[PDB]
Amino acid sequence: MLVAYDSMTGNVKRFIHKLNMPAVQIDEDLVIDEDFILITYTTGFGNVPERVLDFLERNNEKLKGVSASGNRNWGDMFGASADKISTKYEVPIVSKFELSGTNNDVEYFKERVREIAT
Amino acid sequence: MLVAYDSMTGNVKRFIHKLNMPAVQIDEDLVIDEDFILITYTTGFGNVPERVLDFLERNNEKLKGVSASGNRNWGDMFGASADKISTKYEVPIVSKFELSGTNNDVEYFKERVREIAT
Amino acid sequence: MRAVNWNKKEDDFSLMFWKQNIAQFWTEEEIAVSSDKNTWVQLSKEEQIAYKRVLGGLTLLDTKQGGEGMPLVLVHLENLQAKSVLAFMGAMEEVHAKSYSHIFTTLATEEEIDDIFDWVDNHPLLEKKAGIITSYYRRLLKPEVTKKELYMAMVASVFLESYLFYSGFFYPLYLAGQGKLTASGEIINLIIRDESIHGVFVGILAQQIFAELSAEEQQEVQKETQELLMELYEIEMAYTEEIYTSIGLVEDVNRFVRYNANKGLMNLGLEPKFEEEEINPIVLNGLRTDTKNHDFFS
Amino acid sequence: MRAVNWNKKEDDFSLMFWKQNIAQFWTEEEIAVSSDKNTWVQLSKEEQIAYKRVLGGLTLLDTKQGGEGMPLVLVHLENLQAKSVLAFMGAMEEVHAKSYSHIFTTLATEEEIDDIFDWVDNHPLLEKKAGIITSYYRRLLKPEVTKKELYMAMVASVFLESYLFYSGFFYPLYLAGQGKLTASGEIINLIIRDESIHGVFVGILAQQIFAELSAEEQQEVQKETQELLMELYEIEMAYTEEIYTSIGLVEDVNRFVRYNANKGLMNLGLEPKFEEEEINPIVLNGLRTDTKNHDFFS
Ligand SMILES: Cc1cc2c(cc1C)N(C[C@H](O)[C@H](O)[C@H](O)COP(=O)(O)O)c1[nH]c(=O)[nH]c(=O)c1N2
Ligand SMILES: Cc1cc2c(cc1C)N(C[C@H](O)[C@H](O)[C@H](O)COP(=O)(O)O)c1[nH]c(=O)[nH]c(=O)c1N2
Ligand SMILES: [Mn+2]
Ligand SMILES: [Mn+2]
Ligand SMILES: [Mn+2]
Ligand SMILES: [Mn+2]
């Protein structure tokens, strides 16, 4: 299954390279026409990056789940971009992880997506 | 006539030395029992320094007028310590001047006090 | 090594100035300037060029004060509470500089703005003016400075805060005192409110160091302070000649420059050197704005 | 000379971090801590000493970052927008340092506070820890620095922001996660919110400089970065031994130190060097506070 993602300072990009899954970085024009999982980072005060928001306006019909990278220093705003996308589009939160993720984060993600894809 | 004054960075103190009038710097304990003119500086946002406020609680029966040093950079708050004391205790504003005052400020003050002392 | 302890005061002044800094905190998003374009199109071409040029010059001076002046003075101070105040004042210099870009965005196109900044960078007079001030700052780029070097850097800083800005501040205040570009004038007044207390504070610090100098060094810095004042004055007169001749305001600005030079001297505890004249009454009107009483703590 | 022009972006990051700085602006007057004394009297003597000692150590580190770290890095940067962000971050380091005094005023008497600051100044371990970091800063006290010297100073700064604070942050978070000294915990969380974005920003700047180094210099700074990490780690273990042995938390804090060392490395774009363990669940509870969502712009 396809993974769509966005990264500003490289942490999500590094997480992606641990997954060994088909993955593509989003831009403003990109159109995905098959089921995908979104991985976004968290910016602002628990907010979704604007480029991810714009991308989802065109592509939310094929969105099946969301993970978020963040930092537990943000308290209840940890990975809260996932919560906002999950409630907005009624898709599950796949997982939340810190920065580039641990090896347990990787395996938890792959187990969660195999669970979802049925 | 006695001049009571307060100065934090010396500008009012320098104005005082141009006057050649009997003058005394205020402290917390000071009691004046004869008519006096108060010269204060302006602090905060057009505010009276707290030491001047405390001094006036004990000595306002003998207060006959107030001048204020300030800086016209403060717009309508220029010398506004004088306005607050003038309305609080119903005494005239003698004059407002900038920092240590000009020679015209000195002569205007001495003319104003001779006017008041009758 | 010493940590800053605000429960034991290191001087009689730093706490009051720390609190005043923060009470005066503001950012450019608080003042919308788009309504100014209604009066900006009423100005002649020569008036618009003068306005863009003075703002470019102010932007340069705030850039140097936030990026060189405050950090290099504060790093050599031993008073940790005074050091704290200067760090915050240096941050507000960057807020000032950014606020001029907020004005430009409204008044000029992208290409107009680049042209103005090209002009600022390459103008020989601004280079010489800024270079004189920052040469006192760059002396402090070494591990050990003398009290004389630190004193002269504070003098340079007061002369910038209290004196060199004002050939530029004159024109936004002059227009705002006539009801033109009044939103921009509000920002300029918030800037002036900050610089007024910046100049007082650095002047206090300079006077404390002065008292620690030897008799011979006091005589040396007194002479050097007077030469620097007059050297900068010669430059300001050439600058006002270049900027304001086309709009007929040279004599007015020069009077305003001498008026603020006297205030800068008094901030250092020194006697005025120019004849006392009253402020231009239109500039004085431009200094009256309801925005200047805003307290962050309320 | 160049003036800062915010209408043409010098990089892809400085504007977003400028705005985030200001949205996170706060001052100690916003959080009253007097209600903490109800739980402070419930702590044992050994617990109170540990708490006062870690706050003294944090105060020292913020003092050095605001008075040496940010100003000496920013003065050598050529990017004027990034320079602006660092000046504001340096001002917030002074707000942090002052906020610890606000906590002390409530918890301790005048004489207790002086004793703690005497202890901080003369503690050989804090001297060595702070001295290692600031030796990278003091190299920059000269007119011309190399890119290698500037890179290593940014590494030092990230290691302070993202790693060296946390042996001290651990204990206020541990107590607040148990419902003790929760008002003080709110201030510590506001501080952590700032340091989190400080470390990210300086890490970005360091990575841009890294790409400009020659192949040989990249190899040199990579080795020196690894030696500095481990040198600081040896010191942190001695420090946690001295502070936390009496209250039985040494192993917990050391785990938390390695956990944040890995984050500091990732801020520089480097791979983690310590084994991955999950955060202490009580510390994690202490990081949840309603105060952390406060936006100045709202
Ligand atoms: C300005 C700003 C604001 C935030 C963050 C960072 C920055 C710079 N980050 C942390 C961020 O999400 C984390 O570092 C991610 O790993 C960033 O991912 P990329 O490296 O951009 O993929 C963050 N994390 C979180 O869990 N909640 C939040 O509210 C924020 N807010
Ligand atoms: C923090 C702070 C706040 C203010 C001032 C200064 C400072 C430092 N000053 C200017 C001040 O009144 C002027 O410099 C006087 O000359 C100070 O007099 P001494 O030098 O203390 O006698 C000032 N002046 C004014 O006219 N209105 C005001 O609101 C203020 N506010
Ligand atoms: Mn300024
Ligand atoms: Mn200033
Ligand atoms: Mn800090
Ligand atoms: Mn920091």
UniProtKB/TrEMBL annotation, chains A, B:
SUPFAM superfamilies: Flavoproteins. InterPro entries: Flavoprotein-like_sf, RNR_Ib_NrdI_bac, RNR_NrdI. It holds the Pfam family Flavodoxin_NdrI. One of its GO terms (molecular function) is FMN binding. Keywords: Flavoprotein, FMN, Nucleotide-binding. The keyword Nucleotidyltransferase does not apply. The keyword Nucleotide-binding applies. FMN binds at residues 7-9, 11-12, 42, 46, 71, 77, 79. Probably involved in ribonucleotide reductase function. Belongs to the NrdI family. NCBIfam families: nrdI (TIGR00333). This is Protein NrdI. It comes from Bacillus cereus.
UniProtKB/TrEMBL annotation, chains C, D:
Tetramer of two alpha and two beta subunits. Coiled coil: none annotated. Belongs to the ribonucleoside diphosphate reductase small chain family. This is Ribonucleoside-diphosphate reductase subunit beta. Keywords: Deoxyribonucleotide synthesis, Iron, Membrane, Metal-binding, Oxidoreductase, Transmembrane, Transmembrane helix. It catalyses: a 2'-deoxyribonucleoside 5'-diphosphate + [thioredoxin]-disulfide + H2O = a ribonucleoside 5'-diphosphate + [thioredoxin]-dithiol. It comes from Bacillus cereus (strain ATCC 14579 / DSM 31 / CCUG 7414 / JCM 2152 / NBRC 15305 / NCIMB 9373 / NCTC 2599 / NRRL B-3711). The chain crosses the membrane at residues 150-174. Mn(2+) 1 binds at residues 62, 93, 96, 161, 195. Fe(2+) 2 binds at residues 93, 161, 195, 198.
